[PDB]
Structures are given as structure tokens and as C-alpha cells.
Amino acid sequence: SSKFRHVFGQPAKADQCYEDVRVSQTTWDSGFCAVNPKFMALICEASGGGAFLVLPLGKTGRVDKNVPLVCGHTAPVLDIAWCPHNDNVIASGSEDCTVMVWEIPDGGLVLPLREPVITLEGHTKRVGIVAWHPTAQNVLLSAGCDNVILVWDVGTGAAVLTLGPDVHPDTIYSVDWSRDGALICTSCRDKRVRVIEPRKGTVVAEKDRPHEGTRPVHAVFVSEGKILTTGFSRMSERQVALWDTKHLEEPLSLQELDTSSGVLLPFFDPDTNIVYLCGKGDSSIRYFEITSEAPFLHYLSMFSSKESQRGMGYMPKRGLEVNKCEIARFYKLHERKCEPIAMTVPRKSDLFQEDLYPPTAGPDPALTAEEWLGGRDAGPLLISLKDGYVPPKSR
């Protein structure tokens, strides 16, 4: 058995969830919840603009109806993402066509936050994808319904790269940065998954029609030289496929799951080679392991529940209870509640479990924006999760 075969989900008790939250009812295939070691954020239902909630992680229990929110946007927020290099900075993309970057005080909001640090204006339609660069300071990608990808230097406010509708002629379903941020992987409604070096726009690999169905495909980078997709058969059977980007003629493995209409969002953990799959409308979270042993993609198990998810966040490693063998933590949105679900490896030790917790991508950038734009690549600067290792301060 995999060392991860008996990984299991454990929902937090009511006193450790966040209750009575006005979760956004907008129909959109993003997570709607973004969390980091300091804060939980989720997108709110707002009828006169855009808003999302940010709370210190410790502020569990019922949320006051008059809680201060992050506002500024003039139409519904579609996507939120925390900066991997600063636990106080979050970006939001909105139906108002802007991306706004916010700084959150330690201790959380005292008053509504209405003015962002910077507003990034350039999309001409709603912005439903934001993604921070994993290794280069201040670099942020957005993709809008104008089918344009912009890359921004948030330190200057400038749009520094543009991939136009000649690159993605139809809706962009997903964009993922590679481990070192030297590439992006995009999945498009024109049924092509592209691996692109975004500084020059070079398409270095492309898979035409990874799935036969008419519903969306999402794609992520996984272990080196490999990508994973979720999609549908012609008859709407949901599927997960693992691909070798050097040999895209057929997948390394294609696995049929069930028959739903819900889009499965993949979450890949490089530290364990586990991929989790969760879709809006489902009550379950499936997980697989990726190995170099054929058939390469291996099913592990599934977390089951009685409640359908309306969104899902995912805690960075620095937020996990390493001493309790927690290897992931999901933040599940359902109805008016945000519910943490620990993913745990059943072990019993007082010692730091090195095999479960290799050094992990840390909060200090490996490159400046200008260094990266000038063509330098670098993997993330790694840190130890062991008690006693103090993470770098954010810039």
C-alpha cells in the first residue's frame, strides 16, 4: 500500500468552522475560498458591487452580519488568491474587469477595506482567474473573458506581458504556473491545452482534445514533465488523465470517475505527489498518487460527506499541523458555512516525520520581477516545516 493509502478527512467541529457567512451565489468554476496561515477569505454575495470576507484564522464561530469586508470592486468578485510571498496580501478579480491587490493588517480588518494598494486595469471583460507567480517577486497573472492573459508587476502596477486572443481564441478554463514559474499551462474552450513560456509566448507543447466531452477541462502541472487534466467523455462521464508533455498522443493514464455535470478542480501537492479532486456540487474529495510506476496515476481513497460543496480553499503547508500528521487542509464552503477538513496520515510518533514533510516552497521569492522578466528562471526557495525553523519575513 502507498504510505498515503489510509489518508483520511476529518471535518472541524462547529466551534472551529465559520458560520452564517453570505457565500457568493455567482455561477463560476473558481474555488471561492482562499486561505493562508494567517487568514481565511471567501467570496461574498454582494448585490451593489463586489465584496469578499477576510478573517484571522483563529476567529472561528458565527460571523457577525456587520463584519467588515474587502470592497472596492463595483461588480461581483470571481476569484481570490493569497500572495505566496506575503501572508498579508491578496488579489481579487471581478466582473468589473479589474484585478485589485489588497494589504490586510495583522489582526484582520477593523473597518471595511475600500481602497486597494493597486488596481490593475486592462481586461475588457470579467476577470475570473488570478494566479501569483510561484518564485518571482510581485509577478501576478490574470486571465479574463476577453480571452487575454496579462502578467503584471504589482510593484510598479504595470502590465508587463500580454497573450492576446490569437493565443486563446475562446474561454480560458484554467491557467497554472509551473513549479519554477518558467511556464504556464492553459486549458481553453477551443479544446486545446497549451504549455507556454509566457515571456515570449512560445507554445512548447500542446494537446488537442485531451477529452471528448463538451464540458470544461481543467489542467495543472504535476511531477516534472507531466500535466494532469480533468474533463468529460462524450457522454459526460467525468475523467482524470495524466499526460507526459513530451509524448501527448495518448495519456499515461485515463480514469473514469462518475457521471456528473460538476467540474472537478485539481489540487496538486508536489511534496507528496498527491492530487486531490473536488468539484462544486459534489460532497466528496477524491485523491490519487502520482508515481513513476505504471500505471502512473494511482487511486488512493475518497473523503465522503452529506454536504455539497459550493467552494473550496486549500491551506499552504506552513499552516498545517505537522505534529499531527496533517498533510493538507481543505476549507469547504457549504450553504452559509466554511468548514476546515484536515487530511491526515495515520501515524503515531513524537518525532518529525521527514518522509511526509520534505523541505517545501517557502515565502521568500527566488527572483525579482525584473530578473524573471529578463529571462532568469529559478525554483522556489525552500524551507523546513520542522518546529523551530523560522520562516523568512515577507518583503
Short mmCIF file of C-alpha atoms in Angstrom, two decimals:
data_model
loop_
_atom_site.label_atom_id
_atom_site.label_comp_id
_atom_site.label_asym_id
_atom_site.label_seq_id
_atom_site.Cartn_x
_atom_site.Cartn_y
_atom_site.Cartn_z
CA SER A 1 0.00 0.00 0.00
CA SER A 2 1.03 3.59 -0.58
CA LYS A 3 2.13 5.40 2.54
CA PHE A 4 -0.85 7.56 1.65
CA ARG A 5 -3.41 4.76 1.17
CA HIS A 6 -5.07 5.47 4.54
CA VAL A 7 -5.07 9.25 4.35
CA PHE A 8 -8.44 10.39 5.73
CA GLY A 9 -10.52 13.54 6.04
CA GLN A 10 -11.64 14.97 9.37
CA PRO A 11 -14.09 17.91 9.45
CA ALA A 12 -13.51 20.52 12.18
CA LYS A 13 -16.13 20.90 14.96
CA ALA A 14 -18.68 23.75 14.76
CA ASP A 15 -16.66 25.93 17.14
CA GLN A 16 -13.77 25.68 14.65
CA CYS A 17 -15.75 26.46 11.47
CA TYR A 18 -17.01 29.89 10.30
CA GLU A 19 -20.82 30.08 10.32
CA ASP A 20 -23.54 32.37 8.95
CA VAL A 21 -21.32 33.60 6.07
CA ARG A 22 -23.02 35.05 2.96
CA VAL A 23 -21.28 32.78 0.46
CA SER A 24 -21.42 34.09 -3.13
CA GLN A 25 -24.14 32.55 -5.26
CA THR A 26 -22.41 33.50 -8.53
CA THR A 27 -22.06 30.63 -11.01
CA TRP A 28 -18.30 30.33 -11.65
CA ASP A 29 -15.75 27.49 -11.57
CA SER A 30 -13.19 29.06 -9.21
CA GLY A 31 -12.63 27.98 -5.59
CA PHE A 32 -14.45 30.96 -3.95
CA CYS A 33 -12.31 30.39 -0.87
CA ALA A 34 -8.63 31.17 -0.40
CA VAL A 35 -6.72 30.57 2.79
CA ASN A 36 -3.22 31.00 4.15
CA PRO A 37 -1.52 30.52 7.57
CA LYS A 38 -2.86 33.89 8.81
CA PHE A 39 -6.30 34.25 7.19
CA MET A 40 -9.40 32.68 5.72
CA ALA A 41 -11.01 34.51 2.79
CA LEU A 42 -14.18 33.70 0.87
CA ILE A 43 -16.20 35.49 -1.82
CA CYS A 44 -19.42 37.12 -0.57
CA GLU A 45 -22.84 37.58 -2.12
CA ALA A 46 -22.94 41.32 -2.94
CA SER A 47 -25.68 42.97 -4.99
CA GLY A 48 -24.30 46.53 -5.19
CA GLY A 49 -20.66 45.89 -6.01
CA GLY A 50 -18.08 43.24 -5.20
CA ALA A 51 -17.03 42.02 -1.78
CA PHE A 52 -15.14 39.28 -0.08
CA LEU A 53 -14.61 38.34 3.56
CA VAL A 54 -11.19 38.06 5.27
CA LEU A 55 -10.90 36.75 8.86
CA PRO A 56 -7.93 35.88 11.04
CA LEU A 57 -7.85 32.07 11.00
CA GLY A 58 -8.45 31.94 14.76
CA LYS A 59 -11.70 33.91 14.57
CA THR A 60 -13.95 30.83 14.29
CA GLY A 61 -17.65 30.59 15.13
CA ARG A 62 -20.60 32.60 13.85
CA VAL A 63 -19.59 35.62 11.77
CA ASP A 64 -21.42 38.86 12.60
CA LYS A 65 -23.63 40.10 9.76
CA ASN A 66 -21.93 43.50 10.02
CA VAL A 67 -18.38 42.12 9.76
CA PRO A 68 -16.07 44.46 7.81
CA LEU A 69 -15.38 43.24 4.25
CA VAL A 70 -12.97 43.94 1.40
CA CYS A 71 -14.97 46.05 -1.08
CA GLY A 72 -13.60 48.46 -3.75
CA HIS A 73 -14.89 46.38 -6.68
CA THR A 74 -18.02 47.71 -8.42
CA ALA A 75 -19.31 44.30 -9.50
CA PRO A 76 -19.14 40.68 -8.18
CA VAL A 77 -15.75 39.19 -7.30
CA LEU A 78 -14.94 35.97 -9.22
CA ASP A 79 -11.56 34.84 -7.93
CA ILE A 80 -9.26 35.50 -4.94
CA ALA A 81 -5.69 34.33 -4.27
CA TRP A 82 -3.16 34.96 -1.48
CA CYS A 83 0.38 36.01 -2.45
CA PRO A 84 2.69 33.06 -1.79
CA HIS A 85 5.39 35.52 -0.60
CA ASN A 86 3.33 37.65 1.81
CA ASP A 87 0.62 36.29 4.09
CA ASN A 88 -0.97 39.77 4.24
CA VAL A 89 -1.50 40.32 0.51
CA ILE A 90 -4.39 39.05 -1.56
CA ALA A 91 -5.54 39.67 -5.17
CA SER A 92 -9.13 39.66 -6.38
CA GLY A 93 -10.56 39.51 -9.92
CA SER A 94 -14.02 40.93 -10.64
CA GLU A 95 -16.93 41.30 -13.04
CA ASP A 96 -15.85 44.98 -13.06
CA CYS A 97 -12.92 43.80 -15.28
CA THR A 98 -10.27 44.82 -12.76
CA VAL A 99 -7.84 42.99 -10.54
CA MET A 100 -7.20 44.65 -7.16
CA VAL A 101 -4.34 43.90 -4.80
CA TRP A 102 -5.01 44.36 -1.10
CA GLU A 103 -2.94 44.52 2.08
CA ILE A 104 -4.60 43.10 5.19
CA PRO A 105 -3.50 44.26 8.66
CA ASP A 106 -2.35 41.63 11.15
CA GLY A 107 -5.31 41.18 13.44
CA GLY A 108 -7.55 41.48 10.40
CA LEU A 109 -9.91 44.27 9.35
CA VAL A 110 -11.18 46.80 11.88
CA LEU A 111 -13.12 48.76 9.24
CA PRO A 112 -14.22 47.93 5.65
CA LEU A 113 -11.29 47.94 3.25
CA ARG A 114 -12.33 50.05 0.24
CA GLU A 115 -9.04 51.23 -1.33
CA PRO A 116 -6.62 48.64 -2.72
CA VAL A 117 -2.84 49.08 -2.85
CA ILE A 118 -3.12 48.87 -6.64
CA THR A 119 -5.86 48.41 -9.22
CA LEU A 120 -4.83 46.65 -12.42
CA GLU A 121 -6.92 47.80 -15.40
CA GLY A 122 -6.60 46.15 -18.78
CA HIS A 123 -9.14 43.44 -19.25
CA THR A 124 -12.24 44.41 -21.22
CA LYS A 125 -14.43 41.62 -19.79
CA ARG A 126 -14.87 39.94 -16.40
CA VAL A 127 -11.73 38.61 -14.71
CA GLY A 128 -12.21 35.13 -13.25
CA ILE A 129 -8.65 33.82 -12.94
CA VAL A 130 -5.84 35.30 -10.86
CA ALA A 131 -2.58 33.43 -10.17
CA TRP A 132 0.53 34.68 -8.38
CA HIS A 133 3.90 33.70 -9.82
CA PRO A 134 5.43 30.98 -7.54
CA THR A 135 9.01 32.36 -7.41
CA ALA A 136 9.30 35.92 -8.85
CA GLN A 137 8.58 38.84 -6.53
CA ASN A 138 5.42 40.82 -7.31
CA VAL A 139 4.53 38.96 -10.52
CA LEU A 140 0.80 38.26 -10.94
CA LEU A 141 -1.13 36.70 -13.82
CA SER A 142 -4.77 37.37 -14.69
CA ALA A 143 -6.99 35.88 -17.36
CA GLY A 144 -10.30 37.39 -18.39
CA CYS A 145 -13.36 36.57 -20.52
CA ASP A 146 -11.76 38.76 -23.19
CA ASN A 147 -9.54 35.62 -23.57
CA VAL A 148 -6.49 37.76 -22.83
CA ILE A 149 -3.81 36.82 -20.31
CA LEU A 150 -2.00 39.73 -18.65
CA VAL A 151 1.06 39.44 -16.42
CA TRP A 152 1.57 42.36 -14.03
CA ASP A 153 4.39 43.67 -11.86
CA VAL A 154 2.38 44.63 -8.77
CA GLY A 155 5.38 46.61 -7.51
CA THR A 156 5.00 49.10 -10.37
CA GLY A 157 1.37 48.45 -11.37
CA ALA A 158 2.49 47.83 -14.94
CA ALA A 159 1.14 45.25 -17.35
CA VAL A 160 4.40 43.57 -18.36
CA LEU A 161 3.26 40.70 -20.66
CA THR A 162 0.16 40.16 -22.81
CA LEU A 163 -1.03 36.99 -24.52
CA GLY A 164 -3.89 38.02 -26.81
CA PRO A 165 -6.95 36.25 -28.35
CA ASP A 166 -4.68 34.94 -31.11
CA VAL A 167 -3.26 32.62 -28.43
CA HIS A 168 -6.56 31.60 -26.74
CA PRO A 169 -9.42 32.26 -29.18
CA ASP A 170 -12.13 31.06 -26.75
CA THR A 171 -12.77 30.91 -22.98
CA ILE A 172 -9.75 30.14 -20.82
CA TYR A 173 -10.90 27.48 -18.32
CA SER A 174 -7.70 27.38 -16.24
CA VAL A 175 -4.14 28.69 -16.02
CA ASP A 176 -1.44 27.10 -13.81
CA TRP A 177 2.16 28.19 -13.24
CA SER A 178 4.86 25.51 -13.34
CA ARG A 179 6.95 24.86 -10.19
CA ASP A 180 9.57 27.45 -11.12
CA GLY A 181 7.14 29.71 -12.97
CA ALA A 182 9.11 29.30 -16.22
CA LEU A 183 5.96 28.06 -17.93
CA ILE A 184 2.21 28.27 -17.72
CA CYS A 185 -0.29 25.54 -18.63
CA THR A 186 -3.61 26.77 -20.01
CA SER A 187 -6.81 24.96 -20.88
CA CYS A 188 -9.07 26.55 -23.48
CA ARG A 189 -12.68 26.10 -24.69
CA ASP A 190 -11.17 25.53 -28.18
CA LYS A 191 -10.25 22.17 -26.59
CA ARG A 192 -6.51 22.73 -26.58
CA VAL A 193 -4.25 22.51 -23.52
CA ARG A 194 -1.12 24.60 -24.11
CA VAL A 195 2.20 24.79 -22.28
CA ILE A 196 3.58 28.27 -22.88
CA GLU A 197 6.74 30.21 -21.96
CA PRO A 198 4.87 33.43 -21.22
CA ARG A 199 7.69 35.98 -21.63
CA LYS A 200 7.97 35.27 -25.38
CA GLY A 201 4.66 33.41 -25.73
CA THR A 202 6.37 30.28 -27.04
CA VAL A 203 3.97 27.31 -27.17
CA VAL A 204 6.36 24.49 -26.22
CA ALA A 205 3.75 21.70 -26.03
CA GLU A 206 0.07 21.41 -26.96
CA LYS A 207 -2.57 18.72 -26.60
CA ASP A 208 -5.52 18.93 -28.92
CA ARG A 209 -8.71 17.42 -27.42
CA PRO A 210 -7.49 15.68 -24.23
CA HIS A 211 -11.17 14.82 -23.56
CA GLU A 212 -14.08 14.04 -25.90
CA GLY A 213 -16.86 15.82 -23.98
CA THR A 214 -18.48 19.22 -24.40
CA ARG A 215 -17.92 20.36 -20.79
CA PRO A 216 -14.87 22.23 -19.36
CA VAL A 217 -11.38 20.80 -18.99
CA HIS A 218 -9.02 21.95 -16.21
CA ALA A 219 -5.26 21.35 -16.32
CA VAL A 220 -2.42 21.53 -13.80
CA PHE A 221 1.28 20.81 -13.77
CA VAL A 222 2.15 17.75 -11.68
CA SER A 223 5.53 15.94 -11.22
CA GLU A 224 8.29 17.03 -13.61
CA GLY A 225 7.40 16.89 -17.34
CA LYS A 226 3.80 15.85 -16.60
CA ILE A 227 0.40 17.53 -16.58
CA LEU A 228 -3.00 16.34 -15.35
CA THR A 229 -6.42 17.20 -16.72
CA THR A 230 -9.97 16.77 -15.57
CA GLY A 231 -12.67 16.60 -18.22
CA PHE A 232 -15.59 14.64 -19.60
CA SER A 233 -16.28 11.78 -22.02
CA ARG A 234 -18.58 12.45 -24.99
CA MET A 235 -21.38 11.05 -22.82
CA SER A 236 -20.49 13.26 -19.80
CA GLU A 237 -18.61 10.67 -17.76
CA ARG A 238 -16.09 12.63 -15.65
CA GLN A 239 -12.47 11.71 -16.24
CA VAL A 240 -8.98 12.39 -14.90
CA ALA A 241 -5.93 11.95 -17.17
CA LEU A 242 -2.19 12.10 -16.61
CA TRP A 243 -0.07 13.22 -19.57
CA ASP A 244 3.60 13.15 -20.50
CA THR A 245 4.16 16.55 -22.14
CA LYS A 246 6.87 15.03 -24.36
CA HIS A 247 4.53 12.30 -25.70
CA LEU A 248 1.00 13.70 -25.82
CA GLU A 249 -0.52 11.22 -28.35
CA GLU A 250 -2.20 9.27 -25.55
CA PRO A 251 -2.45 9.81 -21.80
CA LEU A 252 -0.21 7.88 -19.43
CA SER A 253 -3.45 7.01 -17.65
CA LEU A 254 -7.12 7.93 -18.11
CA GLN A 255 -9.56 7.10 -15.34
CA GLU A 256 -13.34 7.24 -15.46
CA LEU A 257 -14.89 8.56 -12.27
CA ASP A 258 -18.67 9.05 -12.33
CA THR A 259 -21.40 10.77 -14.32
CA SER A 260 -21.86 14.35 -13.13
CA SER A 261 -22.02 17.82 -14.60
CA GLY A 262 -19.75 19.29 -11.87
CA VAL A 263 -16.30 20.45 -12.94
CA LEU A 264 -13.55 18.77 -10.88
CA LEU A 265 -10.87 21.17 -9.72
CA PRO A 266 -7.46 19.56 -9.21
CA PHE A 267 -5.10 20.45 -6.35
CA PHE A 268 -1.62 19.05 -6.76
CA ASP A 269 0.77 18.70 -3.83
CA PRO A 270 4.38 18.49 -5.06
CA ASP A 271 5.65 17.45 -1.61
CA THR A 272 3.66 14.19 -1.61
CA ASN A 273 2.80 13.80 -5.33
CA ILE A 274 -0.87 13.59 -4.29
CA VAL A 275 -3.58 15.15 -6.42
CA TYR A 276 -6.95 15.94 -4.85
CA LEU A 277 -10.10 16.38 -6.95
CA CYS A 278 -13.12 18.43 -5.73
CA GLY A 279 -15.94 19.93 -7.76
CA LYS A 280 -18.74 22.33 -6.92
CA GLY A 281 -21.88 20.39 -6.23
CA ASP A 282 -20.07 17.26 -5.02
CA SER A 283 -19.95 16.03 -1.45
CA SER A 284 -16.68 14.16 -1.91
CA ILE A 285 -12.95 14.76 -2.31
CA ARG A 286 -11.02 12.10 -4.23
CA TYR A 287 -7.27 11.69 -4.04
CA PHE A 288 -4.70 9.98 -6.24
CA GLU A 289 -0.92 9.47 -6.05
CA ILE A 290 1.40 10.05 -9.00
CA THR A 291 4.35 7.65 -9.22
CA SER A 292 6.91 6.54 -11.81
CA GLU A 293 5.37 3.06 -11.53
CA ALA A 294 2.98 2.20 -14.37
CA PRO A 295 0.05 2.90 -14.45
CA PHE A 296 1.49 6.18 -13.00
CA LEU A 297 -1.77 7.62 -11.63
CA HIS A 298 -2.94 5.58 -8.60
CA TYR A 299 -6.23 6.00 -6.80
CA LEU A 300 -5.88 6.25 -3.03
CA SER A 301 -9.29 6.97 -1.47
CA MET A 302 -12.11 9.50 -1.10
CA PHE A 303 -13.43 11.74 1.66
CA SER A 304 -17.22 11.43 1.72
CA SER A 305 -19.85 13.62 3.35
CA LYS A 306 -23.50 14.59 3.45
CA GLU A 307 -22.99 18.17 2.26
CA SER A 308 -22.37 19.55 -1.22
CA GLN A 309 -19.52 21.99 -1.62
CA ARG A 310 -20.15 25.47 -3.02
CA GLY A 311 -16.44 26.25 -2.97
CA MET A 312 -13.11 25.03 -1.64
CA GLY A 313 -9.88 26.53 -0.33
CA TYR A 314 -6.61 24.78 0.34
CA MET A 315 -4.16 25.54 3.15
CA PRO A 316 -0.44 26.09 2.34
CA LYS A 317 2.00 23.73 4.09
CA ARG A 318 3.11 26.38 6.63
CA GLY A 319 -0.44 26.33 8.04
CA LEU A 320 -0.59 22.58 8.68
CA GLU A 321 -0.37 20.71 11.95
CA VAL A 322 2.84 18.84 11.11
CA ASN A 323 2.91 17.36 14.61
CA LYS A 324 -0.47 15.72 13.93
CA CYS A 325 0.50 14.31 10.51
CA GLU A 326 -1.83 16.71 8.73
CA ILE A 327 -0.73 16.77 5.05
CA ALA A 328 -3.48 19.01 3.67
CA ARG A 329 -6.40 21.02 4.90
CA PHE A 330 -9.39 21.91 2.80
CA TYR A 331 -11.73 24.78 3.55
CA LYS A 332 -15.08 23.64 2.31
CA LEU A 333 -17.85 26.13 1.54
CA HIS A 334 -21.37 24.90 2.05
CA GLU A 335 -24.57 26.83 2.44
CA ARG A 336 -23.59 29.59 4.87
CA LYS A 337 -20.55 27.86 6.35
CA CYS A 338 -16.81 27.48 5.81
CA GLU A 339 -15.65 24.13 7.18
CA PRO A 340 -11.98 23.12 7.59
CA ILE A 341 -11.31 19.44 6.76
CA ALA A 342 -7.96 18.04 7.85
CA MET A 343 -6.36 15.40 5.65
CA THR A 344 -4.35 13.13 7.90
CA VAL A 345 -1.83 10.30 7.58
CA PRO A 346 -2.49 7.83 10.37
CA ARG A 347 0.85 7.58 12.18
CA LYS A 348 1.95 7.63 15.79
CA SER A 349 5.28 9.37 16.54
CA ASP A 350 6.70 12.15 18.66
CA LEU A 351 9.36 12.76 16.03
CA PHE A 352 9.29 14.98 12.97
CA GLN A 353 8.21 12.77 10.04
CA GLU A 354 10.76 13.77 7.37
CA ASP A 355 9.39 11.44 4.68
CA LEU A 356 5.97 13.15 4.90
CA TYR A 357 7.36 16.67 5.13
CA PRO A 358 10.28 17.30 2.79
CA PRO A 359 11.51 20.90 2.54
CA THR A 360 8.75 22.91 0.89
CA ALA A 361 8.33 26.05 -1.22
CA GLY A 362 8.76 28.99 1.17
CA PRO A 363 7.61 32.64 1.37
CA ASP A 364 10.83 34.33 0.14
CA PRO A 365 10.95 34.99 -3.64
CA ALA A 366 13.80 33.38 -5.60
CA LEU A 367 13.88 36.18 -8.22
CA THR A 368 12.91 39.86 -8.57
CA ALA A 369 10.23 40.70 -11.15
CA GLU A 370 12.81 42.34 -13.42
CA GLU A 371 15.22 39.37 -13.15
CA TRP A 372 12.43 36.98 -14.17
CA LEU A 373 11.19 39.26 -16.99
CA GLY A 374 14.78 39.48 -18.27
CA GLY A 375 14.75 35.69 -18.72
CA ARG A 376 16.13 34.19 -15.45
CA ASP A 377 14.38 31.07 -14.07
CA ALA A 378 14.61 29.71 -10.53
CA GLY A 379 12.82 27.16 -8.37
CA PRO A 380 11.18 28.26 -5.11
CA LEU A 381 13.42 28.98 -2.12
CA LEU A 382 12.72 26.04 0.22
CA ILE A 383 12.14 25.96 3.96
CA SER A 384 11.88 23.27 6.63
CA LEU A 385 8.49 22.64 8.25
CA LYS A 386 10.15 21.24 11.39
CA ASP A 387 9.31 23.00 14.67
CA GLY A 388 11.97 25.63 15.25
CA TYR A 389 12.68 26.62 11.65
CA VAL A 390 11.55 30.26 11.46
CA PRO A 391 10.20 31.15 8.02
CA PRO A 392 11.67 34.22 6.19
CA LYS A 393 9.95 37.57 6.67
CA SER A 394 7.85 38.77 3.74
CA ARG A 395 9.02 41.74 1.66
#
